[PDB]
């Protein structure tokens, strides 16, 4: 149902996608280890945000590692190309993790914005229905990424709207609660907002590969645009979300965070 099943791959194409996903496993699980160790230097009120990235990291992780195994399961070298065998590959399982990866990030962004209580829970509930929104219409479109490209843009169209709509929430929150933010991180938080519009725009581009490049190199590009969007919303966004909590933790008087920052 997917363009990936349409082609045979040269060995270079196939080894490259495999090294991509594998390098992408190496990284979520090695970011995973950093996010563990620095969690002791984060104040009790921010510490779930570091932890949440421990989850992001295992979750893109598993599916990423899972895509790499299914890649080598699905294809074998026959007569000079890698050809599809008995099992399929697909990015279908990538959109389900998006289901889980985002609320969590959205959650760690909300946590360091210093949202609390009813605004925090409320804004989490809306944010989560919205991207969940964006995510599932994404899902249903790529379903027709071979049979019915009209549903790709049309479902593309729909999921985009949600993406616009949700950025609006996040941005409003971010620029509203800049002034609560301690240690200089009111400057930093606007940067993440920006970074975050890059990694998540890689996605629609990654989602129009069949419309505009329905061949084997588009399959590869699509995965390439997957590893960076991936590394950026999960790993770099993550890295960047960690620094604000430690900074704000030292600003609020958390001596392990002070000591950690002063050590560097």
Q: Dihedral angle at the C-alpha atoms of 13, 207, 225, 69, nearest 10 degrees?
A: -50
> Per CB under 5 A, which of residues 167..206 are in contact with Cl ion?
none
Contact of 19 with 226, CB cutoff 8 Å: no
- As given in the structure block, the two tokens for residue 85 are 């065998």
- Least separation in angstroms between residue 205's CB and Cl ion is 16
Round to whole Å and give the CA distance between 152 and 207.
8
- Report the residue number, 12 or 26, with the smaller CB distance to Cl ion: 26
Q: Which of ligand OLA, ligand RET, Cl ion, none sits in contact with 64, Cβ below 5 to 8 A by type?
A: none
Tally of residues, the chain: 264
Interface with ligand RET, residue 27, by CB under 6 A: no
Angle at 51 between CA 48 and CA 52, to 5 degrees: 85
Round to the nearest angstrom and report the end-to-end CA distance of the chain.
51
- Could you say which of 21, 25, 42, 43 contacts Cl ion (CB under 5 A)? 43
What are the distances in angstroms from CA 117 to CA 31, 114, 240, 261? 30, 10, 24, 29
- Could you say which of 24, 61, 156, 183 contacts ligand RET (CB under 6 A)? 156
Round to whole Å and give the CA distance between 215 and 233.
27
Q: Pick the closest to residue 64 from 96, 107, 108 (CA basis).
A: 96
Q: Which of Cl ion, ligand RET, ligand OLA, none sits in contact with 134, Cβ below 5 to 8 A by type?
A: ligand RET
Residue nearest to ligand OLA (CB): 26
Residues at the contact surface with ligand OLA, assessed by CB under 6 A: 12-13, 16, 22-23, 26-27, 30-31, 33-34, 36-37, 40, 151, 154, 158, 188, 227-228, 231, 235-236, 239-240, 243
- Report the residue number, 93 or 243, with the smaller CB distance to ligand OLA: 243
- Least separation in angstroms between residue 236's CB and ligand OLA is 5
Q: Which of ligand RET, Cl ion, ligand OLA, none sits in contact with 22, Cβ below 5 to 8 A by type?
A: ligand OLA
Q: Report residue 15: phi and psi, to 5°.
A: -60, -30
Q: Which of ligand RET, ligand OLA, Cl ion, none sits in contact with 238, Cβ below 5 to 8 A by type?
A: none
> Per CB under 6 A, which of residues 43..102 are in contact with ligand RET?
98, 101-102
Interface with Cl ion, residue 45, by CB under 5 A: yes
DSSP H stretches of helix in 75-207: 92-112, 117-142, 149-177, 185-207
Residue nearest to ligand RET (CB): 138
* Residue whose pair of structure tokens reads 């400057």 in the numeric block: 187
* Beta-carbon count within 10 A of 252 CB: 16
Q: Contact positions toward Cl ion, by CB under 5 A?
A: 43-45, 60, 97, 101
Q: Contact positions toward ligand RET, by CB under 6 A?
A: 98, 101-102, 134-135, 138, 141, 156, 159-160, 163, 200, 203-204, 207, 233-234
């Amino acid at each position: 149902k997917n363009i990936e099943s349409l082609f045979d791959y040269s060995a270079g194409q196939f080894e490259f996608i495999d090294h991509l996903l594998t390098m992408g496993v190496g990284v979520h699980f090695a970011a995973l280890i950093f996010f563990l160790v620095v969690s002791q230097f984060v104040a009790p009120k921010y510490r779930i945000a570091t932890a949440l990235s421990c989850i992001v990291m295992v979750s893109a992780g598993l599916i990423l590692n899972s895509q790499a195994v299914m890649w080598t399961d699905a294809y074998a070298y026959v007569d000079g190309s890698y050809q599809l065998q008995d099992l399929t590959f697909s990015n279908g399982y990538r959109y389900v993790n998006w289901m889980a990866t985002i609320p969590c990030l959205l959650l760690q962004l909300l946590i360091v914005l210093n949202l609390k209580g009813k605004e925090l829970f409320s804004t989490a509930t809306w944010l989560i229905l919205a991207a969940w929104g964006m995510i599932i219409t994404g899902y249903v479109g790529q379903l027709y990424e071979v049979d019915d490209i009209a549903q790709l843009m049309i479902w593309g169209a729909v999921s985009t709207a949600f993406f616009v709509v949700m950025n609006w929430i996040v941005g409003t929150k971010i620029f509203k609660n800049r002034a609560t933010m301690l240690g200089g991180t009111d400057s930093t938080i606007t940067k993440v907002f920006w970074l975050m519009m890059f990694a998540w725009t890689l996605y629609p581009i990654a989602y129009l590969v069949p419309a505009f490049m329905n061949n084997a190199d588009g399959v590869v590009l699509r995965q390439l645009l997957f590893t960076i969007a991936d590394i950026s919303s999960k790993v770099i966004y993550g890295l960047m979300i960690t620094y604000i909590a430690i900074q704000q933790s030292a600003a609020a008087g958390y001596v392990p965070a002070q000591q950690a920052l002063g050590r560097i």
